[PDB]
Design an enzyme around this catalytic site. Structure first.
Site, mmCIF file in Angstrom:
data_model
loop_
_atom_site.group_PDB
_atom_site.id
_atom_site.type_symbol
_atom_site.label_atom_id
_atom_site.label_comp_id
_atom_site.label_asym_id
_atom_site.label_seq_id
_atom_site.Cartn_x
_atom_site.Cartn_y
_atom_site.Cartn_z
ATOM 1 N N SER A 1 0.782 -1.242 0.000
ATOM 2 C CA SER A 1 0.000 0.000 0.000
ATOM 3 C C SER A 1 0.815 1.294 0.000
ATOM 4 C CB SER A 1 -0.947 0.067 1.204
ATOM 5 O OG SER A 1 -1.920 -0.956 1.098
ATOM 6 N N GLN B 1 -10.438 -4.474 0.438
ATOM 7 C CA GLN B 1 -9.857 -5.092 -0.751
ATOM 8 C C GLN B 1 -10.898 -5.289 -1.814
ATOM 9 O OE1 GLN B 1 -6.329 -7.909 0.366
ATOM 10 N NE2 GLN B 1 -7.732 -7.868 2.123
ATOM 11 N N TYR C 1 -10.351 3.029 5.705
ATOM 12 C CA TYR C 1 -9.186 2.751 4.864
ATOM 13 C C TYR C 1 -9.544 1.671 3.848
ATOM 14 C CZ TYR C 1 -4.330 1.343 3.626
ATOM 15 O OH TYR C 1 -3.175 1.078 2.964
ATOM 16 N N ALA D 1 1.933 -3.449 3.022
ATOM 17 C CA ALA D 1 2.364 -4.816 2.999
ATOM 18 C C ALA D 1 1.752 -5.549 1.848
ATOM 19 C CB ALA D 1 1.984 -5.512 4.275
ATOM 20 N N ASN E 1 6.054 -9.697 6.052
ATOM 21 C CA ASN E 1 4.989 -8.872 6.550
ATOM 22 C C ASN E 1 4.955 -8.944 8.038
ATOM 23 O OD1 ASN E 1 2.653 -7.389 7.030
ATOM 24 N ND2 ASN E 1 1.306 -8.920 6.121
HETATM 25 C C1 LIG Z 1 -1.651 -2.268 1.544
HETATM 26 O O1 LIG Z 1 -0.506 -2.568 1.976
HETATM 27 C C2 LIG Z 1 -2.846 -3.212 1.493
HETATM 28 N N1 LIG Z 1 -2.356 -4.543 1.608
HETATM 29 C C3 LIG Z 1 -2.786 -5.477 0.798
HETATM 30 O O2 LIG Z 1 -3.625 -5.221 -0.070
HETATM 31 C C4 LIG Z 1 -2.191 -6.813 0.989
HETATM 32 N N2 LIG Z 1 -1.752 -7.227 2.132
HETATM 33 O O3 LIG Z 1 -1.823 -6.554 3.218
HETATM 34 C C5 LIG Z 1 -1.481 -7.032 4.537
HETATM 35 C C6 LIG Z 1 -2.025 -7.630 -0.222
HETATM 36 C C7 LIG Z 1 -2.229 -7.109 -1.493
HETATM 37 S S1 LIG Z 1 -1.934 -8.310 -2.688
HETATM 38 C C8 LIG Z 1 -1.490 -9.458 -1.461
HETATM 39 N N3 LIG Z 1 -1.089 -10.751 -1.713
HETATM 40 N N4 LIG Z 1 -1.596 -8.928 -0.214
HETATM 41 C C9 LIG Z 1 -3.855 -2.935 2.623
HETATM 42 N N5 LIG Z 1 -2.972 -2.730 3.756
HETATM 43 C C10 LIG Z 1 -2.967 -3.329 4.846
HETATM 44 C C11 LIG Z 1 -1.948 -2.746 5.694
HETATM 45 O O4 LIG Z 1 -1.625 -3.458 6.786
HETATM 46 O O5 LIG Z 1 -1.449 -1.634 5.353
HETATM 47 C C12 LIG Z 1 -3.923 -4.406 5.196
HETATM 48 C C13 LIG Z 1 -4.444 -4.529 6.408
HETATM 49 C C14 LIG Z 1 -4.422 -5.341 4.128
HETATM 50 S S2 LIG Z 1 -5.069 -4.228 2.923
#
Ligand SMILES: *C(=O)[C@@H](NC(=O)/C(=N\OC)c1csc(N)n1)[C@@H]1N=C(C(=O)O)C(=C)CS1
Length: 358
Positions: free
Chosen positions: A61, A117, A147, A315, A340
């Site tokens: 992100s 998501q 968010y 992440a 992560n």
């Molecule tokens: C940003 O980092 C975004 N993260 C994700 O979308 C993903 N994992 O997050 C833990 C992801 C995208 S593709 C894949 N295999 N995994 C959002 N950010 C967080 C964060 O901790 O910043 C989240 C809680 C999940 S959604």
């Protein structure tokens, strides 16, 4: 590096790596303008490849910061306005819940509960229209911040429509190239794969998979050098020669809404400096960072405040990163790791490093 920087970096990062079992990490410290680099461990455990200054990390992100700036550059070019309704750019969005939801709402997670998501079943364009047409809000626009990658993701996809370019091609030509971020990619070209670290999740090597609106919300891979240069560019945007990019950066750090002691920019988040570190550290925990909160409109938005802590966590399934800077102090940090690990551990380490250097 000045001895100040090594001591606080080693004293702060060594226990973090051990505590979190992070296989590979890269850190840059920006101090009086110039970046200083540290690396540890492995990009690729199996093939015994070290983390270097050329290793690509998945930013997750943190990619939303590029998205916010590119969106800001589109505003500054006159192609869009944050006051425009969403429907101006996606007319097919005809369901009535889209009434009154603007580009600002999308960019700032205030549309009224668009989800965290995009679901994995949403693969095609028509699946995407479907998903947004059938979503029903939790709240009226501009009352709650939740968010959301589906929210800022949609912003980025709409914000490039007028230019005529794909989002990828717009990002390349309007942001990456002018900033000389030449080892920053939405799609890693095959010749660069040798630099692409593996992510690690419960011991398995992983990369991020294709997904709807991935480029817009979490799709950027970069090196510690290029990320240092991204922080310098956001610390000091007046040094940038391309006018619209310079204004775009300043628009992404404008303060649009406030919740608690935090403000929402375009991808960046800001707080007043001096900051209370409890609030950034605790604020980064998902229990809080992912919760709906009420928002107070900043009427009108405050232009980029120098005296701010500006930051973003990100992440993917196999990576964890963080970028923070303080423009008043000409100070910044980038932390990239191929695991992560919890956000509060990242923020706390960055805070330890940076408050020591100010
Ligand atoms: C940003 O980092 C975004 N993260 C994700 O979308 C993903 N994992 O997050 C833990 C992801 C995208 S593709 C894949 N295999 N995994 C959002 N950010 C967080 C964060 O901790 O910043 C989240 C809680 C999940 S959604």
């Amino acid at each position: 590096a000045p001895q100040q920087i090594n001591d606080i970096v080693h004293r702060t990062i060594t226990p973090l790596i051990e505590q979190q079992k992070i296989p590979g990490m890269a850190v840059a410290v920006i101090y009086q303008g110039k970046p200083y680099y540290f690396t540890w461990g492995y990009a690729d455990i199996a093939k015994k490849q070290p983390v270097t200054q050329q290793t690509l990390f998945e930013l997750g992100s943190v990619s939303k910061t590029f998205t916010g700036v590119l969106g800001g550059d589109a505003i500054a070019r006159g192609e869009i306005k944050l006051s425009d309704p969403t429907t101006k750019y996606w007319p097919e969005l005809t369901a009535k819940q889209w009434n009154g939801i603007t580009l600002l709402h999308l960019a700032t997670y205030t549309a009224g509960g668009l989800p965290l998501q995009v679901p994995d079943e949403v693969k095609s364009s028509s699946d995407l229209l479907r998903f947004y047409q059938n979503w029903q809000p939790a709240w009226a626009p501009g009352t709650q911040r939740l968010y959301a990658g589906s929210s800022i993701g949609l912003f980025g996809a709409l914000a490039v429509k007028p230019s005529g370019l794909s989002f990828e091609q717009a990002m390349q030509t309007r942001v990456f190239q002018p900033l000389k971020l030449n080892h920053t990619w939405i799609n890693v070209p095959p010749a660069e794969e040798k630099n692409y670290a593996w992510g690690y999740r419960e011991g398995k090597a992983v990369h991020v998979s294709p997904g709807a609106l991935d480029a817009e919300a979490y799709g950027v891979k970069s090196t510690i050098e290029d990320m240092a240069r991204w922080v310098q560019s956001n610390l000091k945007p007046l040094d940038i020669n391309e006018k619209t990019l310079q204004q775009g950066i300043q628009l992404a750090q404008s303060r649009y809404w406030q919740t608690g002691d935090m403000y929402q920019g375009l991808g960046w988040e800001m707080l007043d400096w001096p900051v209370n570190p409890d609030s950034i550290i605790n604020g980064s925990d998902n229990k809080i960072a992912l919760a709906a909160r009420p928002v107070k409109a900043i009427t009108p938005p405050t232009p980029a405040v120098r005296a701010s802590w500006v930051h973003k966590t990100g992440a993917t399934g196999g990576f964890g990163s963080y970028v923070a800077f303080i423009p008043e102090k000409e100070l910044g940090i980038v932390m990239l790791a191929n695991k992560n690990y919890p956000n509060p551990a990242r923020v706390d380490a960055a805070w330890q490093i940076l408050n020591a250097l100010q």
